Amino acid sequence: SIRIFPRIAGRSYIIYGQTSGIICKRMEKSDNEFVIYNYISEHYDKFLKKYVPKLYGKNNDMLLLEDLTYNYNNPNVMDVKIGARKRKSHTSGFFSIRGYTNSHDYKFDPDEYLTSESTINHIKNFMEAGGENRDKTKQVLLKWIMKLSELANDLFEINLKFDGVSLIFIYDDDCSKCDVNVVDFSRVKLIDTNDQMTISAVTNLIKILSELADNP
């Protein structure tokens, strides 16, 4: 009666909660992810409310988090790592696509270093389940750009190093609903300045999505 959550990337044990709208993520290595949710909650509460799934509680080593997929009939999900990797450089220069819904169909490989063209093509791949209605897909891109724009603006005033953090892009097959949020705070660190490397990941994504929203 344990139901494994269909992650798109990561190595962490994630299960469905025993009740609706909750997933349980195991803190495998340390409780640093909980320490960081609590720090952001006390120092950057606005950031937490706008950009981050709700943390409802802790049970031993499990975080009870808002299921970002819960309100969707046919969610498509993409995990894009915008914070630094442990040692390796990013597969797309400023960020790494770690996975998306149906990526096996397009021979996506998270180990593969990509050109600009292949990066753009993988984001186009992720958008294909959104069907042939250009106005509807454009509105999904424009809503993502609206929220990433405000995130990149707000990041200038946040003194955290967002190591390992991902953007979770979600849209419904019908293109009636979409969202992007920040997840995975296990390696976030306190620092004296803002994280310019993470801000460049977001502004590069805003550039790519803008080209897609505008193409003829």
Please tell me whether residue 87 binds ligand ADP under the rule CB under 6 A: no
Round to whole Å and give the CA distance between 208 and 67.
27
> Please, what is the minimum distance in Å from the beta carbon of residue 109 to ligand ADP?
16
The answer to the question of whether 184 is labelled as a binding residue is: yes
The answer to the question of whether 136 is labelled as a binding residue is: no
What angle is formed at CA 177 by the lines to CA 13 and CA 12, rounded to 5 degrees?
A: 10
The answer to the question of whether 12 is labelled as a binding residue is: yes
Question: Where is the chain discontinuous (C–N over 2.5 Å), named by the preceding residue?
Answer: none
Per-residue binding string, Mg ion, 153-182, x by CB under 5 A, is -----------x-x----------------
Please tell me whether residue 9 binds ligand ADP under the rule CB under 6 A: yes
SS3 at position 151: helix
Terminal-to-terminal C-alpha distance of the chain:
49
- State the number of CA atoms in the 13 A half-sphere of 208 facing the CB: 21
Please tell me whether residue 86 binds ligand ADP under the rule CB under 6 A: no
Sole binder of Mg ion in the list 5, 7, 10, 213 (CB under 5 A): 10
| Region label for 146, one of left (φ > 0), alpha (ψ between -120 and 50) or beta (otherwise) | alpha
Please tell me whether residue 96 binds Mg ion under the rule CB under 5 A: no
> Please, what is the minimum distance in Å from the beta carbon of residue 15 to ligand ADP?
11
> Please, what is the minimum distance in Å from the beta carbon of residue 40 to ligand XID?
17
Residue 14 interacts, among ligand ADP, ligand XID, Mg ion, none and using kind-specific CB cut-offs from 5 to 8 Å, with ligand ADP
